[PDB]
């Protein structure tokens, strides 16, 4: 299998909806991130959240195709990244654009303990057709990077405890049962909503390095920290990469 | 088809993975950005790598064609990309690294073709947004672009191996799909699809017209086009068939641009 | 005297009143005197989707046969959401400026894609290098309305909301290029004595000076209040017109110089 | 300590914006200092070299005489203030390229304004100082009114320093500080040195200053920087003394409250 | 032979004389054979301001009706000042090169803004991607005349002044695109036996070869001296013309091919 | 003479034809480079190799001029740099584009021990006419940088031991005698092929700092390490710069 480019890297994807909660969620997250900088080398990747839903509403009303909507959503993930990086700037953390993530991450992580980037991939006009909603979103972009780098982990920071058998905030939340552990293939066979992109399950099937991804509640201080040490504090997704 | 208020409600409340939201978004209006434009791919290995004897006659057809058609002309990569992939694959590098190597070769070919067309006013366009396309298409009816998708390190790998599965076929096809173009023509060095590689099978049967599902049934899924393109074609909203033509035969591109069947037509269904 | 100006420029500080007065006597060149700058409201127009944008797209396509248009976009609701997140964190106005810019960029991209098949491009970059050719050839360009101040954004007296937003961004481009007029396209007929959306009986105002607006407490009403001051300092654009883009034909008539909404004058 | 302070019911000042780079020292080098060439630049480079292990530095260069020349040509061509602004900013950039090259062996490079706005924290984790242009990137969107671009090197450098919430901004000039008149001008016989002044006092005054008049306007809306010292960079050691807060030139009070 | 060239390219070093000879027999494509490159002097023209620039803007606007123009700018006195500052500091030619490029950029921006209302753009970037479309549609572009060598600038045998400046940058573009003519627009009628500003004895030279210029000690007189060698190496542009842009009509007549100033020939 | 910008820098140019050999050559070179990082600060510059020959073959067949072929070849040197940098990414090494090499190398070499760049200069459309083959190639570009920086050395890493009196893989290989040491002026006087650009000798004539450049066989492990310590293990080329 491929060599690992950055085997010592930890990748942390921050849900756009966590950022949407504003200071009440961002301030505790920033303090937890601050305390993690001396423990891990971090690539922090932000999702898009509700503003992407708004630009989809306008864009779809205008009839725009999926390759139009994809960079419009990616922009919102970039803005969350600028906000988060600014809160950590005094610690040496800056937001970096996708060409820098792709080609110069090693030198920047030699200079500083963490950088922030967009979790969305730069698919732009070349997003896949089929759905009118861009399929390769923040979870999918974060995982593609983490696996391509051969990183030590990818942790997904959500506004819920993990994956449930139905939307825990949706019309069927009375049936929602928590899944401590699941496989990408089992998830992919189900119908219904998930807190992670369905395309994430597709790129997990072709993954070469990352064996598990944990989805943890960023609204509970300490869970990101525990998850970065491999503690089980959310939903574990087995990717189907097997270990030695 | 549902409603604006219900799509809006769903977009604000549900995960984008919610099938109810997915179905409502599927009912949105469909705008074609460049409905009068045609995307053509000029083969890397099949055409540009062949040099003057292949490229110069096709330059003439392009110059003549842009009086009647609006052309987005994408380039393949070809044998230098195959060499980079061999070196990099041998080093254990992943598809996301190889993708950037293939992009540079398609860039080279676009620059070479573009320099042959520059005196006709036809530019090479690039950058994430392809910002120069609308003015150029309106004014000189043609643009040249590099055919690799911009996925770079975020390239989706194939199920086996590190060769990037989305290359210049996919890059050209997806632009035709994104802009809602009226057709997609792949210019290669054979008349079209055969039952086997016509270069290495002396009695291969020419196939003028085929569906994606029949190509897969015949084991031709990765013969004349990159195999993901056939799945992209079945997912496409705007370009539901493509035509592959022999660019070494004078007039094939010109006739295909006019809508004539001169090679192989591949249809989604 | 080019020599006395040249001499002061070499020998005095640029703050010297004598140099400043000498520079004020310099010739005044208009770069795009035949062009018109239009702002398409983010909140008032683009955020309203198809029912608002599609009729204005038709007017723009029809209008670019008789007028040269630089079409700037507002930002609107998504920038307001970004400002609320960032202001709630206490981030400074220089950081918020970038956030609003990306939303204006989104809206320029969406508008631009509806116009691409008519040859009209979206232009950007610090130098706006694509403007002269596009304007000569297809008679219109779309640009993002935020000024490029970014972290060097001047803050307001209070709070961290950037005070120079897409009204200022569009107005300053009209002024810099010496355009023949500046038209703000919104979702109301123009200026009223109070917000017509929340006011029972506000009175429509068809013409008013900057000083009259300030005296009536309307400084921060229909336009970003700093735009009134930029207007009074402007060399080339000494008045603006605000029109209702939801009424078909208002933009077209305004482009032809018709008084159809509110005309705001520097003096 | 005042009776008004004790009044529980009076309005309270809003919190200040969060500081992005609170440990940073910002140093603005005047273009006219650079214009003196090696005689001024070499001692300043040696002084900067010795400051690198003591301070983390954003070194921002002004434009100097070449911007006066491009103003002369551009005004003769009739160009508006939003055309003159980026032409002058270019000269501040060239001074930055020159100064950074002199410090390259110390790990110092010049960075363009997108890097200054967005990636300064990473670069200052890599190295002890970076150089940039002090002019802001107002470009076409410079404010009209004067035919001379108002937001120049002092103004850009202060906007950055205050936006960052930096520890200080020191302005390095070719004179001792601010006088009551141009100490090199026709009235230099009447020029009186001002060790200390407030920006509001300077703003009401008329006549030339060694600092942009827009500097005083952006000081009025400042949130963090309380004072800016203008010191003579032609006197070795004054920059060093100013960065430690010693009073060696003109202190301008911004009007930001301390407590 | 294509096949032998292919084999030599695969099997030899690019330094092999047999490979170099086979490559020299390759076909020769001219990319913009109907275009003309002109240099507008930095020190000789643009630094002179309105009295020199405005008449030439008028000629450019009228001439682009009949001629396709690539208009490059010199740098001039601000570059001279930067070179003097940087050389006094002991900086090398590769550092000075980037300083000169900024000044040529300034001059292209100023000239471009005078031409903007005629649709003529300023073009840049490593590839000059905007040239083909602009030339087809408005028949002219403005570019910055410095070569992009930056830190890789080759130094002169003596001193640190970049020896390839805006004469060389404009000439090499004419040569690369296979243009039909290269015209240098300066402030004297052409070459003289000595600098006419300092020498009463100076007599005009209408036509001369590179080797004759060198024999007369004129190798570094009206043009940067490496231009004379680049001219003798050129495949496409085997002569250049220098004309006085301070005399109306000289540029216009030179563009139609007329000998109005000094013609310098490779041989 | 000019000041030295980066007097402590070692510049190492890696031949494109060495990269063309693939893992058999690259993996040992990467291990040698890895062990050199704690000893030296390195600007590693890659040449182009066989792919530039192919794009020359096509471009010359299409008739394209030398300023068209120059950036097409430089692109292949860039791709070799991307490949080499990815192999060293876990050491903090990234490929940087030419604007970064020119303007920000000092910051990046404060962050990390080595960066990779293209050895071709960005001459692009302003390449010199005369030959139909771009004269200012990888050796030349690397030397211009090394000399402009006033670097401590430039080492050229070849697929042969050094310079011979004839091409040791060419038709007169039987008469090829090894040259342990030579001057640029003598080489410039000789006719025939060389393993280094002829333009290299021309820019050596105008050099201000670099007194010698060693060409060593990168296929022999240890020769690069020894050359970086001044050991004579290949061909020394004297530039003609003398002590100050
Ligand atoms: N099966 C499920 N288990 C858990 N949450 C679900 C499930 N299905 C839907 N959800 C919803 O998804 C929400 C998380 O929202 P979402 O994943 O869209 O935002 P995000 O990940 O923060 O945004 P982005 O993808 O832009 O980073 C949860 O609050 C929950 O309401
Ligand atoms: N009241 C004043 N006090 C002190 N100096 C003054 C005053 N008025 C004018 N000056 C002049 O201003 C000069 C400095 O000029 P200026 O501020 O333009 O240079 P700079 O700051 O180096 O340039 P830049 O703004 O481009 O960085 C001083 O040498 C002095 O002659
Ligand atoms: N006099 C000579 N001495 C040594 N080698 C020579 C000589 N003449 C030709 N060569 C050939 O040059 C070959 C090296 O080729 P070349 O210099 O083109 O590769 P490179 O330096 O790896 O490529 P690049 O310049 O793209 O980095 C040697 O293998 C040898 O065959
Ligand atoms: N059944 C088939 N019919 C036609 N071509 C085939 C078939 N099977 C394989 N091929 C081969 O597919 C390849 C497609 O040509 P290629 O050089 O990849 O095109 P491009 O240069 O446009 O990317 C050719 O090698 C062609 O011979
Ligand atoms: N007196 C007025 N006349 C006309 N329009 C007004 C007036 N006051 C406000 N508006 C318009 O109403 C819109 C929104 O008003 P604002 O005060 O920003 O509140 P909100 O954005 O919360 O609705 C703006 O586009 C503004 O121009
Ligand atoms: N022998 C000569 N003949 C003509 N001009 C000369 C000669 N020697 C020096 N010059 C000077 O060269 C100047 C043109 O060069 P320059 O001003 O550098 O042009 P540009 O501004 O186009 O770079 C003329 O003004 C002239 O005074
Ligand atoms: Mg989620
Ligand atoms: Mg000053
Ligand atoms: Mg000159
Ligand atoms: Mg070699
Ligand atoms: Na072209």
Swiss-Prot record, chains C, E:
Its GO CC terms are: cytoplasm
**A single GO molecular function term of this UniProt record:** molybdenum ion binding
- What Gene3D superfamilies has UniProt attached to this entry? Acetylglutamate kinase-like (3.40.1160.10)
> Where does the record place it?
Cytoplasm
Q: How does activity depend on pH?
A: Optimum pH is 6.5 to 7.0. Above pH 7.1 molybdenum is released.
Is this entry keyworded Cytoplasm?
yes
Output the Pfam families linked to this UniProt entry. Answer: AA_kinase
Name the residues that span the membrane: none
Q: What induces it?
A: Requires molybdenum.
Q: Which keywords belong to this entry?
A: Cytoplasm, Metal-binding, Molybdenum, Storage protein
The UniProt similarity line reads: Belongs to the UMP kinase family. Highly divergent.
**Function summary:** Intracellular storage of molybdenum. Binds polyoxomolybdates. Can bind at least 90 molybdenum atoms per protein molecule.
Subunit record text = Octamer consisting of 4 alpha and 4 beta chains.
Please give the name of this protein: Molybdenum storage protein subunit beta
Q: Which organism is it from?
A: Azotobacter vinelandii (strain DJ / ATCC BAA-1303)
Swiss-Prot record, chain D:
Q: Give the record's keywords alphabetically.
A: Cytoplasm, Metal-binding, Molybdenum, Storage protein
Q: How does activity depend on pH?
A: Optimum pH is 6.5 to 7.0. Above pH 7.1 molybdenum is released.
Q: Name one GO molecular function term.
A: molybdenum ion binding
InterPro entries for this protein: AceGlu_kinase-like_sf, Asp/Glu/Uridylate_kinase, MoSto_subunit_alpha/beta
Description of what induces expression: Requires molybdenum.
| CDD domains to which the protein is assigned, alphabetical | AAK_UMPK-MosAB
Q: Which domain of life is it from?
A: Bacteria
Q: In this record, what's one Pfam family? A: AA_kinase
Q: Where in the cell is it found?
A: Cytoplasm
**This protein's GO CC annotations:** cytoplasm
Role summary: Intracellular storage of molybdenum. Binds polyoxomolybdates. Can bind at least 90 molybdenum atoms per protein molecule.
Q: How does it assemble?
A: Octamer consisting of 4 alpha and 4 beta chains.
Q: Which family does it belong to?
A: Belongs to the UMP kinase family. Highly divergent.
Name this polypeptide is given: Molybdenum storage protein subunit alpha
